[PDB]
Design a protein around this nucleic acid. Sequence first.
DNA 1: TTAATCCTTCCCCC
DNA 2: GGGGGAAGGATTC
Length: 341
Amino acid sequence: MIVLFVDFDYFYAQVEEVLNPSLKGKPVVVCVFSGRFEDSGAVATANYEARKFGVKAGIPIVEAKKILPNAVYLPMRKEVYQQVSSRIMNLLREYSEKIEIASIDEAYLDISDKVRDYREAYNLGLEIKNKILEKEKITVTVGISKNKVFAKIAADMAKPNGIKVIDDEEVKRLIRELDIADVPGIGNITAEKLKKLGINKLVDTLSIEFDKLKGMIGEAKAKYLISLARDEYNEPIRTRVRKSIGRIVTMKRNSRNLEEIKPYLFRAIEESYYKLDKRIPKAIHVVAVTEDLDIVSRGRTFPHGISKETAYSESVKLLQKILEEDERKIRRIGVRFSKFI
DNA sequence: TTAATCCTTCCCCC
DNA sequence: GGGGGAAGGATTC
Ligand SMILES: Nc1ncnc2c1ncn2[C@H]1C[C@H](O)[C@@H](COP(=O)(O)OP(=O)(O)OP(=O)(O)O)O1
Ligand SMILES: [Ca+2]
Ligand SMILES: [Ca+2]
Ligand SMILES: [Ca+2]
């Protein structure tokens, strides 16, 4: 096994500089304006000009403007980026059938055959890096290692616009010196629970009796960390499948009044069906994000497909189920369609 | 402070 | 006991 991971640099922000180079060299911040008040919303992402100064992903637009009041702030255009990704996702296909598109900007390539070792592999990196830079004018970072997890870690270490190879020897000094919080699939909450167990390095998972671990962070997540620890992790590069689509919208003012919410709910359903594109779900779920930012949801599965008229009808009833079941106020509302026929 | 998949209960019933 | 499918909360990105 030899995995080659590609992960695009400051993607949205970069795609924006690609569509107006004049931006190149200036702090660019890509926002998601909630429109609940002048400059309300957060930062989807920003290029490095803006990051060394603090402006990172997730901070309020307002807070970001206090730091870099004179940086280009642009409204996110997912679609445009979504299309740019697709094109880049093809150049990559041409480099290996066994390909796994992990997200809008990540893809794992199994070049086990194509290449015969890390020398030739690392060269295929530059070859791929360079080709994407030429065809679409985008810089990316390449990680290469024994398995996907490490191939991804390799990338995290080489960015921005870089390439790195993690060889079995390094894999080992990592299975020992890598910070458990930097292991893919281990978010904050799990990284925390693993702290109270004394597990600070991938290795520590070997000293704890499975059941205690299986009881603290779920079974699968447990067996997963172990294999990574005993260098036995080796999952295949499979072409993932969209198992559910949905959209959510923030409202102008929080609310409880049904009629007051419906219009939004529907706006969500409209957008959601359009995305489906020929797909037909058997499952629908209404998702409400309350004023205290906690999430609540309710849904129903049908023994057949859902037509738009059905979605409308059934979603309103499920929203009523939420409002009833919850006394707080609703800050956001959306729907999710899944279980596609 | 702006999408999707995983994990653990339920509940039906051989 | 345990397959098998639903539902909803919990996490990760
Ligand atoms: N709060 C947020 N709101 C919206 N999008 C977000 C938020 N936080 C993160 N994102 C998105 C922003 C990006 O589009 C996507 C992350 O891109 P990501 O792959 O993690 O790194 P990147 O490689 O493109 O950035 P970097 O320059 O650090 O390498 O996550
Ligand atoms: Ca990326
Ligand atoms: Ca991390
Ligand atoms: Ca990502």
